[model samples]
Target chain A: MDKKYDITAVLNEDSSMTAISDQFQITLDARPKHTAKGFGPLAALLSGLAACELATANLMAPAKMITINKLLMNVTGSRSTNPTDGYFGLREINLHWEIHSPNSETEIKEFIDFVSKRCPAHNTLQGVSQLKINVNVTLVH
Target chain B: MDKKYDITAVLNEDSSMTAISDQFQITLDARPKHTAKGFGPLAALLSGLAACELATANLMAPAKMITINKLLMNVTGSRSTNPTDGYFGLREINLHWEIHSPNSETEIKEFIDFVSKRCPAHNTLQGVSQLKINVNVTLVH
Candidate 1:
């Protein structure tokens, strides 16, 4: 139910960044396509997607009175090559989850099922690209 | 043609931000599916698309001896809500541009078309959401 009303981004010859919130200052860097510097922008795109998923999980767990400890996700954008397109960015984005909880496997699965539907990023990438998603509920912070 | 061999992201009970080059940063905030931060994550997804497109155009221009004094883009995220589904983020991303360049209509049109495809952010948003594009290239410095 929380929303960020204004998110802005700008870039100069030297570099680029995105900013949101006056209370908290967070700026992301933008680099030319296909470079080390440019990695942040896309990394963020992936990170934000996972963030949405984790956030939804955080809320859903409590509703079930499930004792949740931590929710963490690691995303990997593997290199993909296409003859016609040359490089198709991330063909395989591995979304591996590390969750800490005291719920049955079935209960945890149900939680993720609901969260998957509600997660903006998960839903967004559903058909857009081929993303490899896996989760382990045995650990976390 | 340039491609990012590696790009990644993560989200937490943490803040939003991206950084690189020891010089630039990019930050995006997460909202609960739909409500409009005016510019939220996906909006910035589209915004970053335009930002990179314009940046590319700016750089492409000078290479061809074209002079672009300034470039800026306005991105609007309008939603497509489904009763059963709830909120489908950014039914359409409107990219309105205000660019200053000493180039012909043909030149500008070509500039937009080429840069549009070359933009990484644009490609990311392509299959993910709908996009409505427009530009004011009639007259500018």
Candidate 2:
């Protein structure tokens, strides 16, 4: 293990969750049957994956001289309950990126490719699910 | 893919993230160098896993005639950047459960075992990492 992280999730009265780490905390509504104030676990999973990808891109771009003006991402997860190899969970994830950058099309593609491969969240999720990334870049002046 | 879940994560100027779904939204501080108000992406991932596990346990216990008074879980994640099979990410996760239940030790163990396997988040994570679950149960009258 290179870095260790710990998180504690406490179940609320309404079956929601308050998850806490040393740095921060957030409430989650894992069960819509009990509450609807917070996001579900699936959303959180996708959110984390998206955030990691964006963060990785941001961190690595400057080194490559890729200037990004803005970026937005939408991740869609397809889930299944039918067991495949004794596992029933997210089967596919699509990351759609809208990017504004001064980089050329090929440069943007290469940068995103590297980001997908280098992001830990993407690597982790790829083990159990399929991932597809689509990018639409708008060249910035 | 039996069901589809969609989530959007938008990057903030300070490098924080606002991740949204149809049902809810959360602010995540994926980059601590930029901001520290929200939890990191890694924490969100673990929290979702923990919340899913707890929700699964709660939903399945009654069907097994097991009674749970209270339950809490602490999930510790050990991350590694060392590439394995060209992949680098979380290597091990330990799920520590504290339960207050009116069930025999054997029954509780059986329930938890089922919950661990049935939870989608757990199943998803088991593909890339090692998982260990430790349970401490208090008998409730």
Candidate 3:
């Protein structure tokens, strides 16, 4: 079956935007909302990228016979000042992974590379952005 | 000044991932959290894209002398089955816009195109996917 995702976003007169899906809602505001809390669009975009990376690791672990004990990832997105193809876009992404798993360090690193190639969000960003990804796996007793 | 965004994602042993930023937090779970509500990574990704589009419109409206009374956008993302560059990524995106503005139809459309060119998320995706975007503008009283 084909997979499809749908989202609706409404731009308010106040310059804030609300994004809604069937299962979730998120607000995007560049300015401080004071009473309300929301994130910037770029911030949300980077978060989604981070989430997708970790989720992809979890999804592919079972098939690879890897057991994850602990996993944490930090993602940094750098924006470009110089326009690329006529617009300033994401310039680079840095993904730092710290994991505790039964697998060997080399094995886990290989797995990370494998997942990056298949992760939809990562693949999308990898096209136009320079990515610096590294993984450190701690042995799980 | 250089713009940067950072996010940290923790993967729970339960297979769910939590993504946190300074002002926001989001959960990505492939399965239902039951007691907790969250969305999948792709869903979040689409939502971010939707938000960026609307925000871009708002940002550029003033410069274009376009006054927007109301703006609503629906975004649909289609996933690919075949691998592109060794990855199964997003295949297509459809953006539907409904707006109430005082600008003429042609003027509004030109603004939409202008915003799409400048929107970071849209520019990124437009590099790899096919986009079908349309707008319906109603003159505001």
Candidate 4:
């Protein structure tokens, strides 16, 4: 059985927080909310995914077996208006990951596969779920 | 033997250029002159190289077999000063290319290899050399 672990993180301008305790840092930027609305949350979500992948890769390596010199993530996503707020919105997120290696192809492939499976954000995006909301209203004369 | 071609293009705010034809358009902002310094010419050189690569890729295939989906260039080399009256002084340019395909890896690799060999800018960067001049003038009263 695969061991499951919980990961939590806070978004920062130049760093991210994740459940995994690794020194690697991932940067985050909130997308503009008005003109191209959906990007903010989508960027956050993908950043979460990227952080999870980096953390997992760091945790699984046999020290000498893993060697990732540089990793850059380009998050392209948009969001639609919040129904409660009636603001402009949409969800458009595209994630680009560049992996650099001076190692064998087999080793790189193994790391890619492992990171894909262990990344929490990747798992969430793959799964289906619904959100429940509660609202309060007041009447004024 | 491979066919060769020369193409020139201007950078625009958006990814729209006739020279690009049916290829994916990618662009990045130009950094300030103070930062680029001697390596500035590299940007123009790399853009020329990228354009040539796209042109060759388009011509050899029955259809557009591979597309440049992403690019990341870092200007590391520098030129001391302007070569002409209209040109800017000191420039640094970095070039990076990423091609994507729904096709097979083997086919993409072969196409890339062909582009590298056929593109003139790629050859110029590797083997060609030109003279560099530094001038100091004093005014006589």
On lDDT, the leading prediction is: 2
The TM-score of chain B in candidate 4 is 0.42
Q: What does candidate 3's lDDT look like per residue over A7-103, in tens digits? A: 8888875678888878578777765436435777777777788788888888888988778888878887666645544645666667887778878
Off by over 4 Å in 4: A1-39, A78-93, A129-141, B1-141
Which 10-residue span in candidate 4 chain A carries the lowest summed lDDT? A132-141
Interface RMSD of each candidate, angstroms, one decimal: 5.4, 2.2, 2.4, 23.7
Best by TM-score: 2
What ordering of candidates by lDDT runs from best to worst?
Answer: 2, 3, 1, 4
What lDDT is reached at residue B37 by model 1? 30
Minimum summed lDDT over a 10-residue window in model 1 chain A is located at A1-10
- The most accurate candidate by DockQ is 2
Q: Which candidate model has the greater DockQ, 1 or 2?
A: 2
DockQ for candidate 4: 0.01
| Tens digits of lDDT, candidate 3, B2-22 | 677787888876677888878
Instruction: Please give the distance, in angstroms, between residue A96's alpha carbon in candidate 3 and its true position after superposition.
Output: 1.2
Give the C-alpha miss distance for residue A113 in model 3, angstroms: 1.0
> Model 3: how far is B15 from its true place, Å?
2.3
Span of ten consecutive residues with least summed lDDT in model 3 chain A: A129-138
lDDT of 4 by residue, B1-141 (tens): 121111212222221111111121112122334332111112222323334334444445445365433311121233333234222222322333344345566666676566555443333233222212121111111
Q: Rank the candidates by TM-score, best first.
A: 2, 3, 1, 4
